[PDB]
Amino acid sequence: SLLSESELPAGISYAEAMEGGSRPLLHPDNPVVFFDISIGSHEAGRIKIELFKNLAPKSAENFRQFCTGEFRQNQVPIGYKGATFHRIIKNFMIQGGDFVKGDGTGRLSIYGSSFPDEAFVLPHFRSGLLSLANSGPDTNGCQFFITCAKCDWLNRKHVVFGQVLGKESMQVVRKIEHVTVDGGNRPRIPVTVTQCGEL
Amino acid sequence: XLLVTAXXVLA
């Protein structure tokens, strides 16, 4: 189901997304969520994210609940508040959302351990897209990445399910992308979602 | 390489 760049729907070009505010651009019922980011102990700003419920409803709803606190295990909420970005590769992507262990091992979703790939409709055609991290087919969980360049070699292996909105969002993404990392691409100073929610 | 996995990170 993969669309070529010439076939893309309105509202998801880089220019269109950078004009976005707090309301969705691809489909009017798409939720918009946010992360406030701290780099070390410094508030770095806010990333606003449209979740493409119209194209990837299960992936969007999983991410959305992790932003709002609506997913509970035995009455205890769990989600992205306090989650880190544990793997940062300049000119490629920033990876985070492992609220389980903070190291890439976390594989919990609102559906259980892992959930299937939805249709691979959108390509990784530009920076600023949200896509699911996984360990092969049908192993989506809680982790995600934000593209920092086109990464079309990931097409049909990772579901692109959202986009950042507005220029500040991309400024924060670029700041995260350029922090110092160790030999394993782990940041030397933590990058944390200190607050998150739905707009 | 440039993959985004959860568990065995590769080059």
Residue numbers in the entry:
A (entry chain B): 13 to 211
B (entry chain C): 1 to 11
Cite, word for word, the article reporting this structure.
TgCyp23 exhibits the typical eight‐stranded antiparallel β‐barrel structure, with two α‐helices flanking the barrel on either side, all of them connected by loops. TgCyp23 shows remarkable sequence identity with human CypA (~52% of identity) but has a 40‐aminoacid N‐terminal extension. Here, three new structures of the protein in complex with the three non‐immunosuppressive derivatives NIM811, dhCsA, and Alisporivir have been solved at 1.17, 1.20, and 1.20 Å resolution, respectively.
Alisporivir (Debio 025) differs from CsA in the residues at positions 3 and 4. It replaces the sarcosine (Sar‐3) moiety at position 3 and MeLeu‐4 residue at position 4 with N‐methyl‐D‐Alanine (MeAla‐3) and N‐ethylvaline (NEV‐4), respectively. Thr117 exhibits a displacement of 1 Å in the carbon backbone, a phenomenon anticipated due to Alisporivir's additional methyl group at position 3. This alteration induces a slight shift in the L108–140 loop, with the most notable effect observed in the residue Thr117, the nearest amino acid to the methyl group. Specifically, Alisporivir displayed the highest interaction affinity with TgCyp23 (Kd = 15 ± 3 nM) while dhCsA showed the lowest affinity (Kd = 200 ± 92 nM). Comparison of the CsA and Alisporivir complexes structures allowed us to rationalize the higher affinity of Alisporivir, revealing subtle effects due to the introduction of N‐methyl group at position 3. Similarly to NIM811, in Alisporivir, the side chain of NEV‐4 creates steric hindrance, preventing it from occupying the hydrophobic Cn cavity and proper interactions.
